[PDB]
Write an enzyme that holds these catalytic residues in place. Sequence first.
Site, PDB file in Angstrom:
ATOM      1  N   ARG A 175       2.019   7.843  -1.690  1.00  0.00           N
ATOM      2  CA  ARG A 175       3.014   7.305  -2.620  1.00  0.00           C
ATOM      3  C   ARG A 175       4.379   7.957  -2.448  1.00  0.00           C
ATOM      4  O   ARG A 175       5.389   7.395  -2.866  1.00  0.00           O
ATOM      5  CB  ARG A 175       2.543   7.399  -4.072  1.00  0.00           C
ATOM      6  CG  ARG A 175       1.677   6.225  -4.504  1.00  0.00           C
ATOM      7  CD  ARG A 175       1.523   6.144  -6.031  1.00  0.00           C
ATOM      8  NE  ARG A 175       0.914   7.352  -6.585  1.00  0.00           N
ATOM      9  CZ  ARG A 175      -0.359   7.700  -6.417  1.00  0.00           C
ATOM     10  NH1 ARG A 175      -1.185   6.934  -5.716  1.00  0.00           N
ATOM     11  NH2 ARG A 175      -0.808   8.819  -6.959  1.00  0.00           N
ATOM     12  N   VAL A 176       4.409   9.127  -1.810  1.00  0.00           N
ATOM     13  CA  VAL A 176       5.674   9.796  -1.488  1.00  0.00           C
ATOM     14  C   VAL A 176       6.381   9.056  -0.345  1.00  0.00           C
ATOM     15  O   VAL A 176       7.589   8.822  -0.401  1.00  0.00           O
ATOM     16  CB  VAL A 176       5.462  11.305  -1.179  1.00  0.00           C
ATOM     17  CG1 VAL A 176       6.723  11.945  -0.609  1.00  0.00           C
ATOM     18  CG2 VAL A 176       5.012  12.037  -2.448  1.00  0.00           C
TER      19      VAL A 176
END
Lengths: 458, 467, 487
Positions: free
Chosen positions: C350-351
């Site tokens: 998700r980064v």
Amino acid sequence: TTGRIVAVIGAVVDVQFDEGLPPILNALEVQGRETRLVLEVAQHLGESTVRTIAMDGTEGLVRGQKVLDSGAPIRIPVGPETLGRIMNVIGEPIDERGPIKTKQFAAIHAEAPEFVEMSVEQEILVTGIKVVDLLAPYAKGGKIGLFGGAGVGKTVLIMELINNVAKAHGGYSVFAGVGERTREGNDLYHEMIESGVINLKDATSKVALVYGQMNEPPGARARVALTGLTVAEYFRDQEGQDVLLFIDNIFRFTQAGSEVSALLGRIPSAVGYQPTLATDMGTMQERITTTKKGSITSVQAIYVPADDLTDPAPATTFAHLDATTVLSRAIAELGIYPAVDPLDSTSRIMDPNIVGSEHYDVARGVQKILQDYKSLQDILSEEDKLTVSRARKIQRFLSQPFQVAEVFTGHLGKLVPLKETIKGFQQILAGEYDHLPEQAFYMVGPIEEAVAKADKLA
Amino acid sequence: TTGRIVAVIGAVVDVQFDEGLPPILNALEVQGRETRLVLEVAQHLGESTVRTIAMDGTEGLVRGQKVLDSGAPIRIPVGPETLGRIMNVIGEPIDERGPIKTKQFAAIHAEAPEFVEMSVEQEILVTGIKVVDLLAPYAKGGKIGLFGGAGVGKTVLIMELINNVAKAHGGYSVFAGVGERTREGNDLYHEMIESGVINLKDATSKVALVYGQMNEPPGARARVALTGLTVAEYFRDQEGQDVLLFIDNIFRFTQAGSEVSALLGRIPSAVGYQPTLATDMGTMQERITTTKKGSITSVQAIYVPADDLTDPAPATTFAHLDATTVLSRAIAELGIYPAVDPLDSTSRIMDPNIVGSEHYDVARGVQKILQDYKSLQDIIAILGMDELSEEDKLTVSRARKIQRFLSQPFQVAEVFTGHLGKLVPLKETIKGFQQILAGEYDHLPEQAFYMVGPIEEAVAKADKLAE
Amino acid sequence: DLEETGRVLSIGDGIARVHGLRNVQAEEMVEFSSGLKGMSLNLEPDNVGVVVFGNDKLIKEGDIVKRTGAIVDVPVGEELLGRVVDALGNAIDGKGPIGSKARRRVGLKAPGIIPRISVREPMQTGIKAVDSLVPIGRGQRELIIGDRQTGKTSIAIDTIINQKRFNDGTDEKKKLYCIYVAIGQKRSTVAQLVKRLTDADAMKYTIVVSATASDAAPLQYLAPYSGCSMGEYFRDNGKHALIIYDDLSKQAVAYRQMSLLLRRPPGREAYPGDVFYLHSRLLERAAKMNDAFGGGSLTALPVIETQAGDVSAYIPTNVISITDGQIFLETELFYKGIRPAINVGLSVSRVGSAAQTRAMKQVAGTMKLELAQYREVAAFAQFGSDLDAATQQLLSRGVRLTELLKQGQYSPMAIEEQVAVIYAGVRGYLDKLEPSKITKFENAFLSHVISQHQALLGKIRTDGKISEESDAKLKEIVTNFLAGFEA
Ligand SMILES: Nc1ncnc2c1ncn2[C@@H]1O[C@H](COP(=O)(O)OP(=O)(O)NP(=O)(O)O)[C@@H](O)[C@H]1O
Ligand SMILES: Nc1ncnc2c1ncn2[C@@H]1O[C@H](COP(=O)(O)OP(=O)(O)NP(=O)(O)O)[C@@H](O)[C@H]1O
Ligand SMILES: [Mg+2]
Ligand SMILES: [Mg+2]
């Protein structure tokens, strides 16, 4: 009165009282500690002893330690001063900005509005977002299941919803992070500051933040949605607003309830969920509704366990949903923003009786043409070639620049009134813009901007 | 010091002591019994009462019966004179050859060797079994596990390993019969006397036997593995020399624990098991090890209840191994013996830097072709072989030949196969699979490859199947 | 004195029930007469349930138990580097006492919302599939998850070995100190692990915290938190640490044992209601600090073992939800020849791009799309001999890119080397080459560009991208090299 701790087993604490026992749901304040430890009464065990669920870690507690009955359930600051602030489940500021200086406080456990208070009005809540309003519109006092998450522009859609509802309805928002990852809570806060939906320098913030982070005990994560609800209830029941409540995410609400039930020794139900799965859900959900004073409308990020739509958790939640917003990576990889799936997203109030006859037909027409487009993707005649070009330009017209994305994209954001949305898609379905190009419909507001973009591509 | 029985439920016996309470793990002796009845202290219940596990049947016990604390855990004979003998859980001779004339004894409970005591040396132990040597080779002094559901080939394989590796072993062997068939203990005993591995008239025996089979109550089955490994620990540490340790079947240790768990007053964990399954296993397994003092090559048969390798018992066992041979009913049912799953068997030493790049490449090539075929099987069962490219159907035919060349007639399995046993050198195993992969036998019938030794026998079989 | 001491009422299965100890705190460490320690997990009206840090043969009914003002802390600092310790920071490598000048509590709260800044610095694994398609930044929590023997530990070990180049460098900022927490493993496995790191010259910047299979359950329960605190020393002193929890499935099993034996209510899979809280407390302590707090970081790589691929079992579900992303490993991928066995389709970070250098960002975006497009069509790669050129090109390209994500062990790659390989695939230069020869191509290709074209690789890192001139030089090296290779 003052009680004494008699048992500490993880996040469960038993307290004995000599005089008056605190009723179930009352907040108790543990004495002799660095930070505020709240215990919520869950059970009357007998012999003047209550079982409680801790709102924070129980390390260091001693048997015989003093506990004060506060005389009420958890009570939190409510009012305009919550806007732009971050509080936890027990109403403390966690944004390091000082006291939340409201003139009122309110109990987080409140009964759902009575039958007599129900508004039979089936009203659309206009978001000013083309995909949403036309094809899967939000209902005032309704619940919306938000599907998706990573890389599909969820947070930008949330912030634009916050922006649009305030701008068009004068209604504020509440964000309840239930099982919030601390890193993502930090990110969201700063993205909200940059988009301008939170202002740190004046009183113009549009959202109150309530965070129940993942590293907090089951009790805290189970109750934090009610805290958010209570902040929202102030704006509805005291200021007559149509309020937006975000719950991210509703599964972790159910999960925390399950953990709490397990800790209290209750026998688990099918698939390991709490026996009170439906009642835990219902007592929270039923507070989200339209009443005579106003409404709370709720967007709820839904996680689906094992991709099983029949799993008890999503199945119970779906009973309460009136609409879905499905955010799709497939739509995103086509460059369409917001990445809403126009076929998968549905709304109960997409009914000719509730919305316009014009609304219903244009939506049904846009639905049919986009379906027919995917059917004709496999295989055209003059009638088919006309519908393929129309549906592609309809795909682009469902895209839209957001005000919240203005600082990043550089392009001006657009809030589109309901009637302008309907007529725009209607005129393509009537073929008034068959003479015009395809990419002139990408990232515009009202249909006039598409005509203006077509002139610029000459 | 003296106690009295206060409760008897199955194998679980509660004993109350007026004075000195016996520590957990201590062996207690029941008085007024025809044969020695040991109780092992498991818990202090409070109120001067201990909960125990019996090492033999509890029939005939009375509330009030006297029990003596021995002052120590179960202690058994160790040393050279265990060789050629059969002992039970408590160290008594069960071969009717009189006393174990040893003057050295050891407690069956002991601390596991420390981290500083570990050895990192790993060299291949060739078994002459094609599937094992090619894909998941055993290591000298390493921990070997043979997994399988009921009737799929664990014991036949361990008996073949005994035949190929232990019969010509220069050091000592220990076989521990744990919760298995008494008939297999008798078979093995007389086979070893015939092979000369056990000698009844001189001192040349190379194998020590320890048995507590499935006719025994759970206490015996829970501790007999410790008895067998205590014998092995002596040979590792006090004689120093290379020890082979065979255990059939180590699951029976965990199962025995589950039989008594509820009666020990425990809430069950998942699938009916004791909450302590993993720590119990760890304390036992961590003793089954090579150290700086001496080498133990351990081969453990590991039963898989309901054929489910996710069952907590075998699932928890994997982490304790350096090489795993996983057998499968789905393979055995086809007549492919040994029934090793080529796509679920692994070894620490299956490394290009250890076995050389040629060995590694052929093994990975074999696994690829077999996984590719497995992923196609179901598609072509419906759409038909004819839909495949000549490239795909070439790898189907090749994979089916490789599956068959992995099968092998065992010397110990002649009464089941009808074929003479075959042992295949590592070099020949590698060569044979290399050739099949290269397409060097694409012209030969599938069946020529089934149930042979070296690749030359497949060629020879191809001519025989013609006329 | 039943306020500061007590007596054992009963002892069994690592649980002492103690009478007295009226002034004990929840989770306080107490001491038995034998010298064994225990943690006071259950404070009840008539007893304290104490979990035993050792063999219970040394505890008997009536034994005295004392409070000692004990604090559950561990040594912390640079003196642990190169050392193997137990769950409590005791040297177990035989090299003598830890020279520790500082200590830290094992049970501490994570930094909250405010002290953090968004994860933005690459945490380079040197593993192409991860760095390109599942990027990890400093402060992230990224799960490594899959069945037994799917290659989970290997991902972690390559990551640790990769930091040598930054750590041997002068850029005090790119440096990453490593901590490997082994939970429930056998001691010989851990010895093989440390031998591997020592031979790689990786031990000098690594701490090994080890609570193995024969260590008592509470020791295995504590090990992650102990490792974590050691990591936090670096995080709070403006430095960067990487922690691996190998594995959290085993830690949860240890905690379940204690919980069941303390007669806490069993839930799904017999786990207690606080088992999520167990891992969330641990994993939230990995963070990226803002400059006001020194700007240090702790990155966590928890490991979870699944059973028969069930990513939706209880403990997997928990850690999946807690973390910022997951690297999913699969057995069929492993045996098909996809090693590392990463399912790129399911794996997520998700980064994302925020953790990637410009150089990687300029090639990873394309590879991601072309593989995604390939995934929609891959089902009929062995059945699509007739279909049109467009879908034929998707399969041809996608199969090639898949081979380029394969990697051997113990040789993690510099970013410039990664992008040079991904460049060759994405610009199409390998589209005519037989798929089964690609791994062999890359080995030889990489050895050639490292050995002779170190100026080109330097330029890729100097510029922070592949320029036109670098693109031209790469085209001539690859196309000529390929011709010779497929002869
Ligand atoms: N290598 C082999 N060749 C031919 N037949 C075999 C072989 N292995 C097993 N079998 C057949 O299958 C039977 C069961 O094998 P065996 O090794 O006894 O099973 P097991 O896995 O030990 N089962 P259990 O002890 O019940 O858990 C044998 O008696 C043979 O009939
Ligand atoms: N990139 C790779 N290329 C080739 N082989 C590999 C690779 N990664 C791992 N392996 C091998 O695969 C096997 C299993 O890897 P390992 O890292 O032990 O996985 P694991 O899931 O941690 N195993 P376990 O913890 O024992 O269940 C080992 O023999 C490795 O040497
Ligand atoms: Mg058998
Ligand atoms: Mg591992």
